[PDB]
Design a binder for these strands. Sequence first.
RNA 1: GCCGAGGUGGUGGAAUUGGUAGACACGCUACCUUGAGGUGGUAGUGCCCAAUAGGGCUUACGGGUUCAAGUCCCGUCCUCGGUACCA
RNA 2: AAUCCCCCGUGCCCAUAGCGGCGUGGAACCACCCGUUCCCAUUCCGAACACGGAAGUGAAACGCGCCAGCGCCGAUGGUACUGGGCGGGCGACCGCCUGGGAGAGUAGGUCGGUGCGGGGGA
RNA 3: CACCUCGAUGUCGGCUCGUCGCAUCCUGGGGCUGAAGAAGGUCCCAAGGGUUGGGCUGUUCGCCCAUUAAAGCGGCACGCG
RNA 4: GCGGUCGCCUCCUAAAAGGUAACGGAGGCGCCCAAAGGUCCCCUCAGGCGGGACGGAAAUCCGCCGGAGAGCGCAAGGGUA
RNA 5: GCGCUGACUGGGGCCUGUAGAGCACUGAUAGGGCUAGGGGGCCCACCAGCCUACCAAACCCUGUCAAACUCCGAAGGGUCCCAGGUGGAGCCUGGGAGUGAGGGCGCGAGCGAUAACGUCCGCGUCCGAGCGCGGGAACAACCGAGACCGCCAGCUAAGGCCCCCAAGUCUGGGCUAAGUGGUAAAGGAUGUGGCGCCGCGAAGACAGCCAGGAUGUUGGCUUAGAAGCAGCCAUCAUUUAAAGAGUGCGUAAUAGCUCACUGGUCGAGUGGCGCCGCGCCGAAAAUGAUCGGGGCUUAAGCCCAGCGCCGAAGCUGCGGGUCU
Lengths: 175, 111, 76, 141
Amino acid sequence: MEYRLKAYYREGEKPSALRRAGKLPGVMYNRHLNRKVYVDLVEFDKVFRQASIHHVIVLELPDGQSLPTLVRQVNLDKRRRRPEHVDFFVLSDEPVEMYVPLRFVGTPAGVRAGGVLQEIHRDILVKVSPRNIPEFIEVDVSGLEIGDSLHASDLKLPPGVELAVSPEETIAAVV
Amino acid sequence: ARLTAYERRKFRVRNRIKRTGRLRLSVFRSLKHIYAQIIDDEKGVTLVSASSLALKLKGNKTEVARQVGRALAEKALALGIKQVAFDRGPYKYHGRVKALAEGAREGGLEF
Amino acid sequence: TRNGRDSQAKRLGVKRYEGQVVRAGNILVRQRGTRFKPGKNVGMGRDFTLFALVDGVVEFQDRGRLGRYVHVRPLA
Amino acid sequence: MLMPRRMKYRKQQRGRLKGATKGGDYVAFGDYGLVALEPAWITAQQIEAARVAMVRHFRRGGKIFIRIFPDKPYTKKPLEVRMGKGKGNVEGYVAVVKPGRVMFEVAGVTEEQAMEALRIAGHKLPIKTKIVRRDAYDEAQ
RNA sequence: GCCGAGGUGGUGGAAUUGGUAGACACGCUACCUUGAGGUGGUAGUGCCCAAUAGGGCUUACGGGUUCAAGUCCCGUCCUCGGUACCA
RNA sequence: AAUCCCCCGUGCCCAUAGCGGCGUGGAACCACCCGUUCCCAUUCCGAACACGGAAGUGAAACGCGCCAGCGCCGAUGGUACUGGGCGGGCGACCGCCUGGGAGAGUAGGUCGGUGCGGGGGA
RNA sequence: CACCUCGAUGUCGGCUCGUCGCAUCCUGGGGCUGAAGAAGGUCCCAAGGGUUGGGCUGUUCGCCCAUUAAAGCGGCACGCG
RNA sequence: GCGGUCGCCUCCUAAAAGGUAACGGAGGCGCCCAAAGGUCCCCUCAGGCGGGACGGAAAUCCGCCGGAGAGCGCAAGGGUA
RNA sequence: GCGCUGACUGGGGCCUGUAGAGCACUGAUAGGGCUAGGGGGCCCACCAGCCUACCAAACCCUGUCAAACUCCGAAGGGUCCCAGGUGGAGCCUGGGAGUGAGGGCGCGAGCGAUAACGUCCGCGUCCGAGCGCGGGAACAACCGAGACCGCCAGCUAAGGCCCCCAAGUCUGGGCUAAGUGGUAAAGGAUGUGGCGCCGCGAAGACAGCCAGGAUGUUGGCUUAGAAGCAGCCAUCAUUUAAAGAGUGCGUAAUAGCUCACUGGUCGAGUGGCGCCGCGCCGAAAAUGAUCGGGGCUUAAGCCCAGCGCCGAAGCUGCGGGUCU
Ligand SMILES: [Mg+2]
Ligand SMILES: [Mg+2]
Ligand SMILES: [Mg+2]
Ligand SMILES: [Mg+2]
Ligand SMILES: [Mg+2]
Ligand SMILES: [Mg+2]
Ligand SMILES: [Mg+2]
Ligand SMILES: [Mg+2]
Ligand SMILES: [Mg+2]
Ligand SMILES: [Mg+2]
Ligand SMILES: [Mg+2]
Ligand SMILES: [Mg+2]
Ligand SMILES: [Mg+2]
Ligand SMILES: [Mg+2]
Ligand SMILES: [Mg+2]
Ligand SMILES: [Mg+2]
Ligand SMILES: [Mg+2]
Ligand SMILES: [Mg+2]
Ligand SMILES: [Mg+2]
Ligand SMILES: [Mg+2]
Ligand SMILES: [Mg+2]
Ligand SMILES: [Mg+2]
Ligand SMILES: [Mg+2]
Ligand SMILES: [Mg+2]
Ligand SMILES: [Mg+2]
Ligand SMILES: [Mg+2]
Ligand SMILES: [Mg+2]
Ligand SMILES: [Mg+2]
Ligand SMILES: [Mg+2]
Ligand SMILES: [Mg+2]
Ligand SMILES: [Mg+2]
Ligand SMILES: [Mg+2]
Ligand SMILES: [Mg+2]
Ligand SMILES: [Mg+2]
Ligand SMILES: [Mg+2]
Ligand SMILES: [Mg+2]
Ligand SMILES: [Mg+2]
Ligand SMILES: [Mg+2]
Ligand SMILES: [Mg+2]
Ligand SMILES: [Mg+2]
Ligand SMILES: [Mg+2]
Ligand SMILES: [Mg+2]
Ligand SMILES: [Mg+2]
Ligand SMILES: [Mg+2]
Ligand SMILES: [Mg+2]
Ligand SMILES: [Mg+2]
Ligand SMILES: [Mg+2]
Ligand SMILES: [Mg+2]
Ligand SMILES: [Mg+2]
Ligand SMILES: [Mg+2]
Ligand SMILES: [Mg+2]
Ligand SMILES: [Mg+2]
Ligand SMILES: [Mg+2]
Ligand SMILES: [Mg+2]
Ligand SMILES: [Mg+2]
Ligand SMILES: [Mg+2]
Ligand SMILES: [Mg+2]
Ligand SMILES: [Mg+2]
Ligand SMILES: [Mg+2]
Ligand SMILES: [Mg+2]
Ligand SMILES: [Mg+2]
Ligand SMILES: [Mg+2]
Ligand SMILES: [Mg+2]
Ligand SMILES: [Mg+2]
Ligand SMILES: [Mg+2]
Ligand SMILES: [Mg+2]
Ligand SMILES: [Mg+2]
Ligand SMILES: [Mg+2]
Ligand SMILES: [Mg+2]
Ligand SMILES: [Mg+2]
Ligand SMILES: [Mg+2]
Ligand SMILES: [Mg+2]
Ligand SMILES: [Mg+2]
Ligand SMILES: [Mg+2]
Ligand SMILES: [Mg+2]
Ligand SMILES: [Mg+2]
Ligand SMILES: [Mg+2]
Ligand SMILES: [Mg+2]
Ligand SMILES: [Mg+2]
Ligand SMILES: [Mg+2]
Ligand SMILES: [Mg+2]
Ligand SMILES: [Mg+2]
Ligand SMILES: [Mg+2]
Ligand SMILES: [Mg+2]
Ligand SMILES: [Mg+2]
Ligand SMILES: [Mg+2]
Ligand SMILES: [Mg+2]
Ligand SMILES: [Mg+2]
Ligand SMILES: [Mg+2]
Ligand SMILES: [Mg+2]
Ligand SMILES: [Mg+2]
Ligand SMILES: [Mg+2]
Ligand SMILES: [Mg+2]
Ligand SMILES: [Mg+2]
Ligand SMILES: [Mg+2]
Ligand SMILES: [Mg+2]
Ligand SMILES: [Mg+2]
Ligand SMILES: [Mg+2]
Ligand SMILES: [Mg+2]
């Protein structure tokens, strides 16, 4: 649930060079501040595979600090589908917006053995308090039924806060 | 419902006027009173004012108009201003709008 | 082949740019619709052609929603 | 095979292939994918042979995606003729594919299975390819 | 050997513009009719367990395409119009 | 005249000023309103336009506020592309140097700003 | 395609004389066989030599008769006036 | 040679000024209108939903929503409430 | 004749809709969702009517494409102004022309087959007319460089420095074992050198080597019999450190053998996935072979660094000519 990164500071130095030196460029920003940094590619990869804009990265970084950051965009060059720039979003005391995984729980969900699990969104956009950050979200109902649909307001929704628009959407069905 | 016969007709007649280059004798008339304003565009500035609600007069608003009509001349003609165009905006050239114009006599005019 | 046709290039466009000195007559823009609208001291002929109305210099104005304008600000 | 019905214009130039995959580009439907390493025109009849090869090696279930589509009209004279006098004539359709693009991509199957299918499917293509899984990065939206 | 079309019950052959058949026909079997027949008219009839019900197989043969193929893709054999240096 | 608040005119910027929800304003302005004699009217209608009035109402409209659901605006990094200069691959194409540097997207921002002139206030 | 040749680079086929390539028709040597043997199939090595006589047609080609270890495919200005 | 073409307008090709070729990709003109002309005054569409005898997808009518996707005699483009 | 106006350059304004990107319009388009109506399949034949395993409008998500699409939009380019710029610059008037068959290359497109020493335009360049000079083995247009004349002087450019052949068998560090270099692809491979991730492993793996293999049994189904070892299969279940009614031989259904399995020995690494550098296969044409040749293997090959030298008709020194 807790991922450590590291970091450094950028001002000059062409990203081309950093790139060459195993380091991965990137910026750090939010309502209050904005500064350019660079992580270690080999390191960052290890973290992001598991992290993945779903969980929080604390970002060490000289300055001795440890900043609460979500990753809000990853630019990867298409030719080799490897990353080439990460930008980290730092959390403060004010509800944010993010993506939360969807633990497809329950069973074949009604009419079991069998039916259609119908996987739509392994994530979901939610406006939530930076303090309480759901590790995931239980998606069960029971279940379930045949040719039904768990909209969105039917879902669990832990004591985070709420949804992010889209009151009515798929997420569930059997056909 | 975007823009209205009012707003439209307003631009239509007022846009034409602003092409000819002259000073604008803009006429706003309300239910109770009728006001008049000599404006210079490109300078975005008014030169001679003449209301009825500013001359505290009353009694038959077609006759009041003409008064604030002649009132505009006097005040204005004394500033050099002689020739002008005359707005008319949304109002048909009639009644108290026509009246004020007919009052604008004793001052440049051609109307 | 059923194709093979085309028409003579009409050499359309702006003829005087901003900050160019012109003269009453000088046509300033050749265009199809009203891509530019006649501003100060700028006439426009039956083929939508903009020309100086007086001498002076050329200046352009982008009135956004109101379109783009060519003015001939005097100096004469 | 696979052509786009109703077209504003038949016969279109050819343009170049200097691009680098508009995108794309990051997998977005399945568990695994086939990515294009080289630029090429992929023919509807090449796509159909790649699709079939998979649905076939998948017993019949299966769940392709393709993601590339032949909307470009490919012309060609009637051979035995000389230049001039009209153009090509249209003898099929192609899809334009620069590096990066994700073609096909499958889901709902094992790994040692999906990966064997994508390999087969890849042999039907005139370019070099690459098999992918799909990690966070892919979740670029 | 080369390009296009088509191969169907015992026979002739249609649906061939995308959706559930081996039509109406000629046999053949029984029936009406006749003194008995011919013709004509009913009804059975592609195949097999089927009382019917209804399972399932048919579109030259085999292999894939699609939810579905007599039809789209090919391969083999059969056939019809074509067609194969060269100065 | 100074400063300021509200309101009526009229400009300019041309969506950060817009849609929508809610709330407010009638002393004054404005509107609606009250009438259709008169000027003048509606291919029918005093709806509009127009005149004469003013009892009534801020319901409509308009003005002023608040709300970021939509709309609009939108960096910073990083790329794409590319002047110019060099390389590489059979090619299709690719890379380096030096200058310029988007688009999308992210963080955000916004439910206006201001000119002149009036009327009323302090 | 129109690059040398239009102050000329004679054009099919046959005959004659060859020579070269091997993607080998036969003969030599091999592996595999759904190779019992004999006889084949298929692939590999191998260009030393060999690779028939007739009917038809200008024909090349091809069909056919009789044979054969086999009746090889190509290049050489579709080799060679 | 046969075929096609030959002047004029629109669009692309055309590499963000102009211009730019090919038997390159696609269309159109050889008219028309005494009002489809001048001026002054008014008016604002297309659609979508709801409502309404004969009215039907669509005749005429009422309501809300509708910045132009309508219209501008005919091609296309630019333009335009 | 006028004479600082020229190309080019700096700063500033204005014009543009391409490259790129985008999907807001015009169209194209993958999947899913929700729903006009139909395919239907049908209840009726009076409303009807239920369902969607084919459509499929719009609408919503997730994805994309476009020369004749653009909500966007660089770099550049055009033009004017003010500056620099005296140049075989510019402008004006006039005398004389020749050319109006271009070609290669680079870049951007169309045609063609993402063929042509193809063809047609655009912007550049060279050959044309520099078939003069150096390099590229030889070679109009690729690299270098614009040849006034003379020199038995010097420095350089490209390219080179083992010998033919001028100058290093020069100094480091790595790579390659093919003569690769001296090449042709999809694809393929315990070649070789590096980087990395994962699985197992001193509770001791991986090679081998000892030990044992069920049992009701023929499993039943098929079926003289299939008894694992014809076949279809229901493929049991127990027990065990541990053997699947049995993977392969055997096969008058048997016998016997053997294996996936655990114990012991030995004891150390072992197995798999990627990644880069250089190589390997893929690899058959016609007269005599060859990288220009000889020849080259810690290189006389490839990559990274360096220091020197050789090298043109470029530059320099010396003298000379002619024009301005
Ligand atoms: Mg042309
Ligand atoms: Mg044109
Ligand atoms: Mg602009
Ligand atoms: Mg994208
Ligand atoms: Mg029948
Ligand atoms: Mg009888
Ligand atoms: Mg009898
Ligand atoms: Mg009888
Ligand atoms: Mg009888
Ligand atoms: Mg058939
Ligand atoms: Mg079949
Ligand atoms: Mg106001
Ligand atoms: Mg806007
Ligand atoms: Mg509002
Ligand atoms: Mg109130
Ligand atoms: Mg209000
Ligand atoms: Mg009151
Ligand atoms: Mg009152
Ligand atoms: Mg109100
Ligand atoms: Mg008000
Ligand atoms: Mg943006
Ligand atoms: Mg930027
Ligand atoms: Mg931006
Ligand atoms: Mg605010
Ligand atoms: Mg005041
Ligand atoms: Mg010639
Ligand atoms: Mg030529
Ligand atoms: Mg001669
Ligand atoms: Mg001769
Ligand atoms: Mg062979
Ligand atoms: Mg032999
Ligand atoms: Mg034998
Ligand atoms: Mg043999
Ligand atoms: Mg051989
Ligand atoms: Mg003869
Ligand atoms: Mg022969
Ligand atoms: Mg013959
Ligand atoms: Mg013979
Ligand atoms: Mg011979
Ligand atoms: Mg020949
Ligand atoms: Mg000959
Ligand atoms: Mg002779
Ligand atoms: Mg002869
Ligand atoms: Mg002719
Ligand atoms: Mg242009
Ligand atoms: Mg309507
Ligand atoms: Mg209606
Ligand atoms: Mg209705
Ligand atoms: Mg329009
Ligand atoms: Mg039109
Ligand atoms: Mg248009
Ligand atoms: Mg238009
Ligand atoms: Mg000067
Ligand atoms: Mg210039
Ligand atoms: Mg300049
Ligand atoms: Mg634009
Ligand atoms: Mg493009
Ligand atoms: Mg679109
Ligand atoms: Mg559409
Ligand atoms: Mg769809
Ligand atoms: Mg474009
Ligand atoms: Mg256009
Ligand atoms: Mg923008
Ligand atoms: Mg410039
Ligand atoms: Mg400039
Ligand atoms: Mg100067
Ligand atoms: Mg000269
Ligand atoms: Mg001259
Ligand atoms: Mg002369
Ligand atoms: Mg000529
Ligand atoms: Mg010529
Ligand atoms: Mg030319
Ligand atoms: Mg030239
Ligand atoms: Mg040229
Ligand atoms: Mg050459
Ligand atoms: Mg290049
Ligand atoms: Mg070429
Ligand atoms: Mg040429
Ligand atoms: Mg060049
Ligand atoms: Mg010449
Ligand atoms: Mg030369
Ligand atoms: Mg020259
Ligand atoms: Mg020569
Ligand atoms: Mg030479
Ligand atoms: Mg040389
Ligand atoms: Mg030379
Ligand atoms: Mg010289
Ligand atoms: Mg010299
Ligand atoms: Mg030297
Ligand atoms: Mg050098
Ligand atoms: Mg050498
Ligand atoms: Mg030497
Ligand atoms: Mg040495
Ligand atoms: Mg060394
Ligand atoms: Mg062991
Ligand atoms: Mg047993
Ligand atoms: Mg050599
Ligand atoms: Mg000298
Ligand atoms: Mg001279």
